[PDB]
């Protein structure tokens, strides 16, 4: 009995949004998985979507795999460089390619974000069956603005570009809502499976990523729930994180840093609309969880769930971006949205609204961590994760053992009884995994998969981190940080509040050495 796999990825879901991670959002299906399984409080991704996904499916660093930066930010000084191709590339072999070789039915419904051309599709990279959004985002209902020269760059880069296998779709199914479509499709594939062989089911939702949109009936259930604002929410989340044992009672949360007005400085109409966006966000997360529950309910009724290794994670920190703030060259976003969408209060959450919830709502969900998505601080890279598989010894608990997204490919190969092919595959030199199999740790033979000498690097958008054991050095450039290395003891200071660069210069110098090894071994160009 080799197990099935179900790998579910939420897009920009915050650490404490789910019930079992301290949240007020109704997420019964994930809660059941989480509490029965093992909740990870020290699991890490990259600081953005496509780099994480590249890592999840290869077991190595994103700077090797083709996503050295995000496809959308490829300049002339990076384009051409090895591992900056903007898609999953020729120097790695993807997890599903390997499982498919070894008998698995490879099934996917969700966001891809690992390439847009036929040769880069889930179908080209080892999925037998796939229903996929190829870009990093799109309107959840398939409502499209006009595409021409006057269109903001962020919109141009996020069309509703869907493929099913090799067919680039002409229209979308009737009543399309991304999360429901992905649920419908994976369920179709699972119902149509060869019941006698195992599956690798990949369910990368695009919820709860902007634009924030969800069925009215679900939005209505959160009416008034967020009227006290993101700081009142953050305080709630912190108290619950402590009560549940996910964060230690004495942890000091990092201060909230945002350039927007705080809740109490907002006019009544601005508040109502910002609260409505968080309600919509909450609805997206509940609807995602509902779709996950349809998938899981079917597996359970088939007698397969207990023999399915279930991994759930978010792909990066909660999204605190202000889309209007980035001097993305080209046409003005807000002015465009003003002419083509309706963001009045009663419309927010529909197909022809386009909202994001901004930095303070995001910091409520990353707390006690510092900042949010696209930073290399813990806010942007520490994400919620659960593993549910009853054969493992470590279930029903909260673990603070360090782990990364690079661990997942090796863990799953290990469980499938498939050896990584080493340095060659299909007549081509390839990278080997930098992660480590969780199986020792999760079977109870070891206390963790890594130890005090494990070294890990992150690098994206000009930011850096390097970690050894619990010691982490961070580099944030201007204007969002001091453009120097700061040193943190994550065991004592999970908030990354107390810079120890002057107190422990030897420790810092050691980490800077590791940082350079990282740069040279993964091919970081900054």
Q: Distance between CA 334 and CA 349 in Å, rounded?
A: 17
Q: Among Cl ion, Ca ion, none, what binds residue 4 when CB lies within 5 to 8 Å by partner kind? A: none
Which residues ranging from 11 to 70 are in contact with Ca ion (CB under 5 A)? 11-12, 49
Stretch that binds Cl ion, among 34-42, 327-335, 358-366, 391-399 (CB under 5 A): 391-399
Smallest distance, Ca ion to C-beta of residue 396, A: 29
Kindly tell me which residue out of 169, 398, 455, 512 binds Cl ion, with binding defined by CB under 5 A. Answer: 398
Q: Among Cl ion, Ca ion, none, what binds residue 397 when CB lies within 5 to 8 Å by partner kind? A: Cl ion
Q: Among Cl ion, Ca ion, none, what binds residue 49 when CB lies within 5 to 8 Å by partner kind? A: Ca ion
Stretch that binds Ca ion, among 147-155, 311-319, 477-485, 497-505 (CB under 5 A): 311-319
Smallest distance, Cl ion to C-beta of residue 397, A: 4
- The DSSP-derived string for 397-458 is SEE---EEGGGHHHHHHHHHT----TTBSSSSB-PPPSS--SHHHHTTSSS-SS-TT-EEEE
Q: What region does 29 belong to: left with phi over 0, alpha with psi -120 to 50, or beta?
A: alpha
Smallest distance, Ca ion to C-beta of residue 429, A: 30
Residue in 512, 407, 429, 525 with CA at minimum distance from that of residue 63: 525
Q: Which residue is nearest to Ca ion (CB)?
A: 49
- Which residues, 6 or more positions from 175, have their beta carbon under 8 angstroms from its beta carbon? none
Kindly tell me which residue out of 272, 397, 483, 491 binds Cl ion, with binding defined by CB under 5 A. Answer: 397
Nearer to Ca ion by C-beta: 13 or 449?
Answer: 13
Residue in 522, 450, 379 with CA at minimum distance from that of residue 55: 522
Count of C-beta atoms within a 10 Å radius of residue 60: 23
Nearer to Cl ion by C-beta: 74 or 398?
Answer: 398
- Please, what is the end-to-end C-alpha distance for the chain in angstroms? 46
Kindly tell me which residue out of 316, 366, 378, 399 binds Ca ion, with binding defined by CB under 5 A. Answer: 316
- CB-based burial of residue 477 (10 Å sphere; 0-12 exposed, 13-18 middle, 19+ buried)? middle
Nearer to Ca ion by C-beta: 11 or 289?
Answer: 11
CA–CA distances in Å: residue 35 to residues 31, 316, 513: 6, 22, 40
Kindly tell me which residue out of 279, 304, 315, 496 binds Ca ion, with binding defined by CB under 5 A. Answer: 315
Nearer to Cl ion by C-beta: 33 or 508?
Answer: 33
- CB-based burial of residue 164 (10 Å sphere; 0-12 exposed, 13-18 middle, 19+ buried)? middle
How many residues line the site for Cl ion (CB under 5 A)? 2
Matching residue, tokens 């940080």: 481
Q: Among Ca ion, Cl ion, none, what binds residue 316 when CB lies within 5 to 8 Å by partner kind? A: Ca ion
272 is a site residue for Cl ion (CB under 5 A): no
Q: Among Cl ion, Ca ion, none, what binds residue 398 when CB lies within 5 to 8 Å by partner kind? A: Cl ion
Q: Among Cl ion, Ca ion, none, what binds residue 85 when CB lies within 5 to 8 Å by partner kind? A: none
Please report, as ranges, the residues that interact with Ca ion according to CB under 5 A.
11-12, 49, 315-316
Please report, as ranges, the residues that interact with Cl ion according to CB under 5 A.
397-398
């Amino acid at each position: 009995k080799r197990p099935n796999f179900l790998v579910i990825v939420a897009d920009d879901l915050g650490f404490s949004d789910i019930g079992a991670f301290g949240g007020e959002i109704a997420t019964p299906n994930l809660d059941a998985l989480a509490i029965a399984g093992l909740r990870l409080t020290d699991f890490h991704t990259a600081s953005a979507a496509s780099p994480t996904r590249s890592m999840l499916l290869t077991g190595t660093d994103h700077h090797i795999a083709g996503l050295g930066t995000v496809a959308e930010a490829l300049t002339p000084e990076l384009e051409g460089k090895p591992g900056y191709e903007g898609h999953l590339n020729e120097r790695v072999v993807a997890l599903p390619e390997l499982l498919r070789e070894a008998g698995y039915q490879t099934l996917m419904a969700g966001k891809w974000h690992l390439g847009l051309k036929p040769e880069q599709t889930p179908h080209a990279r080892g999925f037998e069956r796939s229903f996929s959004l190829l870009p990093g985002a799109a309107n959840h209902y398939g409502f499209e603005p006009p595409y021409d020269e006057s269109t903001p760059r962020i919109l141009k880069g996020t069309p509703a570009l869907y493929v099913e296998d090799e067919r680039y779709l002409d229209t979308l199914p009737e009543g399309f809502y991304s999360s429901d479509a992905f649920g419908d499709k994976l369920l179709q594939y699972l119902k149509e499976r060869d019941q006698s062989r195992p599956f690798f089911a990949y369910l990368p939702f695009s919820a709860p990523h902007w634009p924030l949109q969800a069925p009215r009936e679900i939005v209505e259930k959160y009416r008034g729930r967020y009227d006290a604002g993101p700081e009142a929410l953050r305080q709630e989340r912190l108290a619950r994180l402590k009560e549940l044992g996910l964060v230690e009672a004495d942890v000091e949360a990092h201060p909230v840093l945002a350039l927007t007005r705080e809740w109490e400085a907002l006019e009544d109409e601005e508040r109502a609309k910002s609260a409505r966006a968080m309600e919509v966000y909450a609805a997206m997360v509940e609807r995602m969880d509902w779709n996950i529950g349809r998938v899981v309910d079917y597996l359970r009724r088939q007698g397969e769930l207990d023999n399915t290794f279930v991994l759930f994670m978010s792909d990066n920190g909660a999204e605190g971006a202000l889309l209007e703030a980035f001097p993305k060259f080209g046409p003005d976003l807000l002015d465009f949205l003003d002419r083509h969408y309706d963001n009045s209060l009663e419309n927010i959450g529909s197909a022809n609204s386009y909202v994001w919830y901004g930095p303070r709502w995001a910091q409520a969900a990353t707390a006690p961590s510092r900042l949010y998505k696209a930073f290399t601080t813990q806010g942007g890279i520490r994400v919620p994760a659960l593993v549910r598989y009853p054969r493992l010894s470590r279930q029903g608990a909260i673990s603070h053992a360090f782990a990364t997204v690079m661990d997942v490919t090796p863990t799953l190969l290990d469980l499938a009884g498939v050896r990584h092919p080493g340095k060659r595959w299909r007549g081509r030199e390839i990278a080997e995994p930098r992660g480590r199999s969780w199986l020792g740790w999760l079977s109870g033979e070891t206390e963790a998969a890594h130890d005090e000498n494990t070294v890990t690097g992150w690098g994206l958008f000009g930011m850096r981190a390097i970690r050894q054991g619990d010691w982490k050095a961070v580099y944030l450039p201007a204007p969002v940080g001091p453009a120097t290395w700061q040193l943190y003891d994550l065991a004592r200071d999970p908030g990354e509040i107390h810079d120890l660069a002057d107190s422990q210069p030897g420790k810092l110098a050691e980490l800077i050495e590791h940082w350079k090894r990282y740069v040279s071994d993964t091919g970081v160009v900054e």
